[PDB]
Design a protein around this ligand. Sequence first.
Ligand SMILES: [Mg+2]
Ligand SMILES: [Mg+2]
Ligand SMILES: [Mg+2]
Ligand SMILES: [Mg+2]
Ligand SMILES: [Mg+2]
Ligand SMILES: [Mg+2]
Ligand SMILES: [Mg+2]
Ligand SMILES: [Mg+2]
Ligand SMILES: [Mg+2]
Length: 224
Amino acid sequence: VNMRDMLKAGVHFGHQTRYWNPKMGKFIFGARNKIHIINLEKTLPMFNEALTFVERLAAGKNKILFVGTKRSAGKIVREEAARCGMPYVDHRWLGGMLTNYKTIRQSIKRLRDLETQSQDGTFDKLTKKEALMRSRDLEKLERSLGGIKDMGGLPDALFVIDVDHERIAITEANKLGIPVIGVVDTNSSPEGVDYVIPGNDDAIRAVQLYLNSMAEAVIRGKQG
RNA sequence: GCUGUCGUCAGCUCGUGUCGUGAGAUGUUGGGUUAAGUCCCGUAACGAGCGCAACCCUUGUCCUUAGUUACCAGCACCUCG
Ligand SMILES: [Mg+2]
Ligand SMILES: [Mg+2]
Ligand SMILES: [Mg+2]
Ligand SMILES: [Mg+2]
Ligand SMILES: [Mg+2]
Ligand SMILES: [Mg+2]
Ligand SMILES: [Mg+2]
Ligand SMILES: [Mg+2]
Ligand SMILES: [Mg+2]
């Protein structure tokens, strides 16, 4: 937005220059002190195009799955999940979540049953050597499946934050043929994603900006 | 049909998903721990079954129920059982 806040937060930065993908060469403005610099001129049109796509997809009661699992990055995804709804994941991505989704329906049902059982006035009124085990199993299931408790169907567009770190999700999203919105850094590969956002990673301010922009865009799209 | 043995050793597999042209692989590998594929943490795997364990019999402590053919603390007698 207006080239200033992005410059301030973290965007014009990359993953050194020893580690990089040649397919990113068209986005690099240059190198500064053995560190690559992202051309912020090219990223703004792509960012705005992603904004319009999310806004127009929101109008129609669809779902955007947010993938942000990373240190200090999945958390902000989780608190961004409140407001504008939409499913999310912030812990490890289970293998075959979008291709073996029929099986994971069963685990979601089990999570729902456990949540009903524990929070119906503490029905776990049995031996104390088993209530703790049941509660910790419930917490373990929650810690992975809580974000996607909703969305009985497949999402119509998957928003990822790091192509390389979460390549499994992008691969199976491509296999299912559903759009992918990704924030590609210098060391990652743009291949496999539809809309590319050549921005920085590993920056709390940057990811905060991206998630808040997504939230406001989807809110505007949802307002109709 | 019934039985021995490896061996009461902790192992043997399947559904869906993914990798390979294929036989196949992953799950079931890795760090710890346990009598145990026992458990935890991690992880293209998510789950489940047969096994392990518990549920059964006996032994050790105590409570309640009842005292005959069993028992004898208190009392009378005893021919002194
Ligand atoms: Mg097998
Ligand atoms: Mg199998
Ligand atoms: Mg298989
Ligand atoms: Mg094949
Ligand atoms: Mg084996
Ligand atoms: Mg095997
Ligand atoms: Mg091991
Ligand atoms: Mg077992
Ligand atoms: Mg047994």
